[PDB]
Symmetry: D2
């Protein structure tokens, strides 16, 4: 087999290490870890070599992009050139790009029939009351975003809280913002990791006592999870819908049923690997092996 695999990321942390690791072990591939910001290239004379620290990169059979949530325009541009050069990517540029846009993504999932929590979109709404009644929620979650980031979620328990929050962010200096209703659940969401056509690993993220969130560490506490065949199907469908080869789908257990809340094109590996003991980084190299062409 023996591939030259590149890993597009900004440094050596567990996930990037765990595949330098699993690609050198598994069918003895060669691996170079490249900062996308240090690539530079002629986007003109179509294709052309990619340059890195004064030398020309040597042609990778595959590229594993792991692009930051703040470097996504240049990151995917570099990714694109590798694709143009022949490298197989897990998660392709177009799909990664789209994925960062939570709005376009939520829309896409919704159109494709995937059960989400009822969700409003807004920026400078002009009539907060009408916005709150739309969506329905007497208590709901407001999620600030700003461009393509996320900079806060907050629970609004009463009508007035939801009003004061929206009116606050309305001062466009916060820009785009999302409304969806809160849950039964209990600060607990299931995170599935999809690689290709299967859910490779899954954990429960539980919130702390003080309010909810649940986030990785906003007071988070991980534990191994018991996914229903229904939840497994959905998390795969979300990834398929998104055109992601590797993805983190987050699911909320509502009375009505499982609801997708978020999809990630660069899920972290540490918490989910350490929690379950599963070789995820290996299932990704294995996926590359089944699809890249040497």
């Amino acid at each position: 087999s023996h591939m030259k695999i590149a890993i597009l990321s900004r440094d050596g942390t567990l996930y990037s290490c765990k595949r330098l690791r699993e690609a050198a072990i598994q069918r003895g591939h060669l691996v170079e870890i490249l900062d996308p910001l240090s690539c530079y290239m002629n986007i003109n004379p179509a294709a052309s070599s990619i340059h890195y620290k004064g030398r020309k990169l040597p042609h990778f059979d595959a590229v594993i992009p792991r692009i930051g949530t703040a470097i996504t325009f240049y990151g995917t541009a570099a990714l694109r050139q590798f694709e143009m050069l022949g490298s197989y990517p897990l998660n392709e540029s177009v799909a990664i790009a789209r994925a960062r846009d939570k709005l376009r993504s939520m829309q896409l999932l919704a159109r494709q029939g995937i059960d989400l929590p009822v969700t409003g979109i807004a920026h400078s709404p002009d009539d907060t009351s009408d916005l709150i009644d739309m969506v329905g929620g007497a208590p709901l979650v407001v999620k600030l975003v700003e461009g393509t980031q996320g900079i806060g979620v907050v629970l609004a328990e009463t009508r007035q809280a939801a009003e004061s929050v929206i009116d606050a962010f309305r001062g466009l200096n916060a820009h785009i913002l999302v409304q969806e209703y809160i849950k039964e659940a209990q600060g607990c969401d299931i995170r599935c990791l999809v690689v290709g056509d299967e859910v490779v690993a899954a954990i429960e993220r539980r919130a702390k006592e003080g309010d909810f969130r649940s986030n990785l560490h906003r007071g988070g506490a991980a534990s191994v999870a018991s996914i229903t065949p229904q939840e497994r199907e959905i998390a795969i469908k979300a990834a398929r819908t998104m055109a992601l080869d590797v993805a983190g789908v987050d699911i909320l257990r509502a009375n009505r049923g499982p609801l997708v809340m978020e999809v990630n094109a660069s899920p972290g590996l540490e918490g989910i690997e350490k929690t379950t003991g599963i070789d995820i980084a290996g299932k990704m190299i294995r996926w590359i092996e089944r699809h890249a062409t040497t």
Copy 2:
């Protein structure tokens, strides 16, 4: 005929006025001018009405997006919902979005065989000298960008100037940056306006005495233009390649031949209309008439 056409833009300026104007005249259409930021809607239960100042919008047969270069994530999200609701757009969401990304666009044009000036892409290159020799240029233009904007172009006449400039912007607080070679020309570029499958109008933009630029007004001076059949074909091909129904293509007259430098999905109307005396806003309403379905 009689359509309800919406115009997605942030205010009443010549271009937005000139089509409220041309749609009310031409086959007596009804027009509402909407700020995208004031739309708010359920992106979930697939489709769902768009809300605006407390009321529900009434279904537009067509939407004319004219989205700002700084509102492009929410703008195209709102655009998308109109599309999902049945409205025909001139310039669709996906195509508009992509267009803002100058990097993805330059790449796309290049791949599709369109003659551009030789162009390097870079962010934090690590070896400026190698970057400068790549691209070739002893004198070249450095174009700062930052995310998806543009915040400066500058001519670097010597090797050292090109060095000092790159090293300056390299401090990532400027982020993504473009290198391409300077011209014969003479601070003068041809701007074509494409509507559908034809170039509807064209002007020459001439720079002032002090250095170049040429920009609309960075010292700009407009005058009617004599486009060659070759230049006309290209400006149409660029728009086709970009999937833009309406576009501003800017062309540089180089010795080698015409070179596309830029493509815009919301070209201004004033300078080009006043200069030529052509009813552009009408050719766009006319285009809508040939393609929207009532």
Copy 3:
């Protein structure tokens, strides 16, 4: 008399016009309106001439700074050099600088015994409940700030609203934030204009029906005002405390008495002049005449 007065501001709008106007009329002074951003100078060899569009400025007997709320670091640097060159300023650099910092200013006023509304300061408080009980308010105003700007005020009517708002902004991407209690009043505040040791003019700013604010135009409606001798004294004391020669003091009429809410070192002239019919721009030139040394 005949002075050379410079006006440090970024353009010709009512206030800047109304003193080019009043300085050319009143004792026939000469006036140049300079953009601070276009000044450039040697801050070293102590003093040294200030340069502007390739020429050296000619020595102004006085400088009227009218520096933007976003240009205040360079603005006051240029201001400083004029001071170093001999020019008398109304509002000096140090005082202007300090004034932009609403936190340092509120603190200073408070220390100097000036009645303010009870006010909490916070950034990432860690225990919102304790913050809300401090300050007291069951209903209070949260005022987002971010560095030195202001980007929103909002009323929180219930405990929960005040909670959700603080928790929202707590995501430091909003940075520094202010809590103070809401009023009787009724979206109405008195704005005094101080020039030297007297209140030169005063208006009432009344809010619209929908909630409060009251702002110039956040639904604002101006009308001539009846200031009590007590309110007049305070607005003068605030300016004195702040070391401002010209200032806009905003006062809230509370049961307890008049409360300073805000102090401005570049108050607008239009609304207050048109409302009252008073020649404010002239009272400022007159002040310059009494204090600048030719």
Copy 4:
């Protein structure tokens, strides 16, 4: 003795550790390390207790501020309240604030007779050529700043390089910018640390081969230094001029003589302590002991 000393900083890193360390050792003081962002307090009813994680802070005899270069408005506001409460600060709020403003500081040093390199100040100069000839330098250093930060320095060796750089940053999206001439020296500057009325420690910072800088690590390499009595006097005078109790003065060895280039109100301790083996953190606690009042 036994003082309660607070350390205002955002975390445990060498310098903050090395004084928790030296204050618990030296005359057995009690130390609490507080994040300024987590303080919250009533700036009104003059003074009032400072709150931290739901509890009231207990009165510190002294406060050691170590405020970030990006938190300086809120940081110094919290600092100010400690001062208002009786705590002795090394480096007081006003002096710290001013210090962040490199422009006001360079100006102040210059006015007070301290030899600096010849330095131009500019933002959007309008005539770069005149700016370059002012300052004199055929080769000079351009230092981007933006508000109050620093985001780049660069050497411009030729006239054209200096032109292209200024014209680049001129696009105000870089904001305020500094010109000063380059050196003999050789990417090497002397860094003195002043505590009170003496230079407590000093190192040489040497640049790498590729161009200059010299920065801590922009390729930096530290080594113990041999300060002349002249250089020692200056570094003390700079700190005195700046009203800093603790300061990092950086000096360039020019033919003409020693030139101050920079003054810091929160110098790092690690590089300078490890290089020289001097107990700096102790000389600061000792200073506090001589001046704080229990």
